[PDB]
């Protein structure tokens, strides 16, 4: 089928800047009727597809003239003049000359903001779930620029790393930070074998580790 | 303007068929669009399934022949998708879109329903309180938290004081564990409103039916 | 002649949407017929549910209100059901039905499939063979059986040497027992036939993906 | 809604012998048009409702002319004019002048034919069953006329009711006769327990009752 090769996968960029992304499409795009069946999409993070671009070069219903849609034959070309914080999520393209109908393999685009540092925060488990057998330690580190973070687990003062689950969420539309949340789980047995509990945070916003803990029997 | 909404199964066993339905409002069916059917896999990969326009005309992609069937209700205006012989493969997030028929503009897209084929039975979820310490309840502001464990399948759909508490909220996206999922959900408020005012998780888990709620209440003296 | 072919789910759960197919041949949908969906109660009482004719114009029951729809796939000459929200009363043999737009003549339905709407679990047949004893391996005739126990939900189809022996068969109705199903079956045979040449029952049920078959041998001495 | 009331509720005939029965609706079924739609169907046992009269008073296709509907405003009678083993199902009869269209309660047809005694056979329980923790002891009458019949369990000369459970098969549509099993389900344990096991049937075409049992050790 007519094959959508998007590039760059992925992108950063600061706000206040534009942008510039490619699809290139194996067969000409353009059909007998002079129309050139091309949309360009975005799809913010937990949100699904929204219209930009359609005809190839045209602004599509209600969207901001800061997007713009160029290039004919094979080779269309998506700008932004100036990037917002809600212009991050994954951009497709979609042609609709050719059956079937395929889209691109989509780019990514990351907005670049001033670092900042997580807030970190640590919870013992629940009396409720201790009582069914089970024990998870949950630590969340929220709001924190740019992704790239490390959490370490410390049962006593020994690092652990069996058992540990975490979970990242998409930058944000609003601020452009990152949150994350790492959870240890353990046997209500082992949990009970032992005092202190930390959450190791390191993040370039500071060279020593955020740190977060707590000792069974306080509060 | 127009708006789409799909509703469906969450959780569809091997070998049988999906149907799904899409309520369009604010348009006639019978009118201009072209009425498509797209799924989004894991990988965030689309692919165009088919669709079925104005005047009821249909078309869809070769790679699902022979198992796909695109139809419509023009009296209650809706379309549907009737996809049989699923496997593990057809997991994946279904959309409705519609776009003009002439020129492919004005594109609307529904919500999209999570679809997951597999043999693993349905489990409601465990919902766990978490409150802070004493270290915490004295300075800046204060984090609370909500663990939902092991449920199946996906989703669940998680909110703070039904949904009042919007701001200051992260909800992580869960993770698959022997078969059944996790996710936990934190709400920051400032450090001088809580506990004076509760604070509640709400958790909704449609493919069981499951609704329970769970107040963030201190740890220790209450 | 047109002919008429139903297929679709043999269980469904509570609060689920009920979907069927109707496969048309020997005829196009798009021309003179009505094509409508009926159903058949445990007591034998009929219910028309609606229709959907050549102009794919549409009419259905007002004791179905806003929980059915009735569309069509001209390409694949099919017509389909939807039942949102069923519950046990439900549960009925669906048929699908046309009947010419103008007169009501040249009826034609097809072969009914059983709908049943329980929390029930899917469970497989246990099938044991039934030879007799020495007392009447020694006489007129003889009579050979088949015994399906335990299995949900209905229906299983029986047959004797896949199919080839059809006279001298009787397949009984299946009695609920313990939310599971037991049914026999019995095949008569010359008494100087059998076990000269073997005598098989094959059983198969639907709803779990299950197909035995068991060879009825002489007891004691083989 | 119109209601159709059908009569009689059953209905035996002897095998050459004319039919007639009534559907009464409580709203008159002619419309605007001249046009009565109404409909009677045929329901063998096992099939599905097939054709016989449209238009109220209309042989239908390929319909044989033995069937005649009649009547109007709002009787309508059906007859045969000389049954036939294959008339015997239940008929409907089907309005389509008011929507929603609703079928009458139906109307079935039992076929009147000599006398025949069942041809009875008993079964121990099967090697693979036991071996399960269970035990079945199926009994079969075939082919027989009168429909009523009655059929005794005995364990070593008593009496057993409890566990005993019976299924019928609808008359046959190419001799009218009927045929029944009688299933004894025991446990393993109770079953081991006794050594005679008797089948014991009582009909018309016998004042002395058919009996058919074995003893455990023999074959
Ligand atoms: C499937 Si679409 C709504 C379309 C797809 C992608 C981009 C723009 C338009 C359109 C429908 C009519 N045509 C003639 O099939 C061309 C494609
Ligand atoms: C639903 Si029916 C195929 C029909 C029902 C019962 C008996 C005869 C005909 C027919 C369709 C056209 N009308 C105008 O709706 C009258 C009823």
């Known amino acids: 089928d007519v094959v959508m090769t998007q590039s760059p996968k992925t992108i950063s960029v600061t706000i206040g800047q534009p942008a510039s992304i490619s699809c290139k499409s194996s067969?000409?795009?353009?059909?007998?009727?002079?129309?050139?069946?091309l949309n360009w999409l975005l799809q913010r993070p937990g949100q699904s597809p929204k219209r930009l671009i359609y005809?190839?070069?045209k602004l599509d219903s209600g969207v901001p003239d800061r997007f713009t849609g160029s290039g004919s034959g094979t080779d269309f070309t998506l700008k932004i003049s100036r990037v917002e914080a809600e212009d991050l999520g994954v951009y497709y393209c979609w042609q609709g000359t050719h059956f079937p109908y395929t889209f691109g393999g989509g780019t990514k685009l990351e907005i670049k903001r001033a670092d900042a540092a997580p807030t970190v925060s640590i919870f013992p488990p629940s009396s409720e779930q201790l009582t069914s057998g089970g024990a998870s330690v949950v630590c969340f580190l929220n709001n924190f620029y740019p992704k790239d973070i490390n959490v370490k687990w410390k049962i006593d003062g020994s690092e652990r790393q069996n058992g540990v689950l975490n979970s990242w969420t998409d930058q944000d539309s609003k601020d452009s930070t990152y949150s994350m949340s790492s959870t240890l789980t353990l046997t209500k047995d082992e949990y009970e074998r032992h005092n202190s509990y930390t959450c190791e945070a390191t993040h370039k916003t500071s060279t020593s580790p955020i740190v977060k803990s707590f000792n069974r029997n306080e509060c | 303007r127009v708006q789409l909404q799909q509703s469906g199964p969450g959780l569809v066993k091997p070998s049988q068929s999906l149907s799904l339905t899409c309520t369009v409002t604010g348009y006639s069916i019978t009118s201009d669009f072209a009425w498509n059917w797209i799924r989004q896999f894991p990988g965030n990969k689309l692919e165009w399934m088919g669709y079925?326009?104005?005047?009821?005309?249909?078309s869809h992609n070769p790679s699902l022949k022979s198992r796909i069937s695109i139809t419509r209700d023009t009296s209650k205006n809706q379309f549907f998708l009737q996809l049989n012989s699923v496997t593990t493969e057809d997991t994946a997030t279904y959309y409705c879109?519609?776009?003009?028929?002439?020129?492919?503009?004005?594109?609307?897209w529904g919500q999209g329903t999570l679809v997951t084929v597999s043999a693993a039975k349905t489990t409601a979820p465990s919902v766990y309180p978490l409150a802070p310490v004493c270290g915490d309840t004295t300075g800046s502001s204060v984090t609370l938290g909500c663990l939902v464990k092991g449920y199946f399948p996906e989703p669940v759909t998680l909110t703070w004081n039904s949904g009042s508490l919007s701001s200051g909220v992260h909800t992580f996206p869960a993770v698959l564990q022997s078969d059944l999922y996790t996710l936990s959900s934190s709400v920051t408020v400032t450090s001088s409103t809580w506990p004076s005012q509760s604070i509640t998780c709400n958790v909704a888990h449609p493919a069981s039916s499951t609704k329970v709620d769970k107040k963030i209440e201190p740890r220790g003296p209450t | 002649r047109v002919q008429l072919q139903q297929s679709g789910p043999g269980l469904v759960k509570p609060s689920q949407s009920l979907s069927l197919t109707c496969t048309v041949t020997g005829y196009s949908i798009t021309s003179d017929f009505a094509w409508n969906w009926i159903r058949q109660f445990p007591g034998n009482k009929l219910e028309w549910?609606?229709?959907?004719?050549?102009?794919?114009?549409?009419?259905?029951?007002p004791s179905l209100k806003s929980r059915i729809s009735i569309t069509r796939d001209t390409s694949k000459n099919q017509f389909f059901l939807q039942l949102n929200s069923v519950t046990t009363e439900d549960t009925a043999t669906?048929?699908?039905?046309?009947?010419?737009?103008?007169?009501?003549?040249?009826?034609?339905?097809?072969?009914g499939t059983l709908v049943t709407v329980s929390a029930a679990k899917t469970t497989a047949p246990s099938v044991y063979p039934l030879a007799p004893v020495c007392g009447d391996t020694t006489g007129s005739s003889v009579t050979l059986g088949c015994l399906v126990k335990g299995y949900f939900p209905e229906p299983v189809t029986l047959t004797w040497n896949s199919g080839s022996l059809s006279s001298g068969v009787h397949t009984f109705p299946a009695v609920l027992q313990s939310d599971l199903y037991t049914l026999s079956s019995s095949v008569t045979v010359t008494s100087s036939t059998w076990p000269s040449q073997s005598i098989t029952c094959n059983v198969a049920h639907p709803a779990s993906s299950t197909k035995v078959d068991k060879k009825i041998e002489p007891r004691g001495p083989t | 809604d119109v209601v159709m009331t059908q009569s009689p509720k059953t209905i035996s005939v002897t095998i050459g012998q004319p039919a007639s029965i009534s559907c009464?609706?409580?709203?008159?079924?002619?419309?605007?048009?001249?046009?009565?739609?109404?409909?009677?169907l045929l329901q063998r046992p096992g099939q599905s409702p097939k054709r016989?009269?449209?238009?109220?008073?209309?042989?239908?296709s390929g319909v044989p002319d033995r069937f005649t509907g009649s009547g109007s405003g709002t009787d309508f009678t059906l007859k045969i004019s000389r049954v036939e083993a294959e008339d015997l199902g239940v008929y409907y009869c089907w309005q389509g002048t008011h929507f929603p269209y609703t079928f009458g309660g139906g109307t079935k047809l039992e076929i009147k034919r000599a006398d025949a005694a069942p041809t009875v056979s008993i079964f121990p329980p099967s090697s693979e069953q036991l071996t399960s923790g269970g035990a079945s002891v199926v009994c079969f009458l075939n082919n027989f006329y009168p429909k009523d019949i009655n059929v005794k369990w005995k364990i070593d000369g008593s009496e057993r009711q409890n566990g005993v459970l019976n299924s019928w098969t609808d008359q046959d549509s190419k001799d009218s006769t009927y045929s029944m099993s009688s299933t004894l389900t025991l446990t393993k344990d109770e079953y081991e327990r006794h050594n005679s096991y008797t089948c014991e049937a009582t009909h018309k075409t016998s004042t002395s009752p058919i009996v058919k049992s074995f003893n455990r050790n023999e074959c």
């Open positions: 879109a519609g776009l003009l028929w002439y020129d492919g503009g004005a594109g609307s």
């Open positions: 067969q000409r795009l353009l059909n007998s009727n002079g129309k050139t069946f």
């Open positions: 079925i326009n104005y005047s009821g005309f249909t």
């Open positions: 005809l190839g070069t």
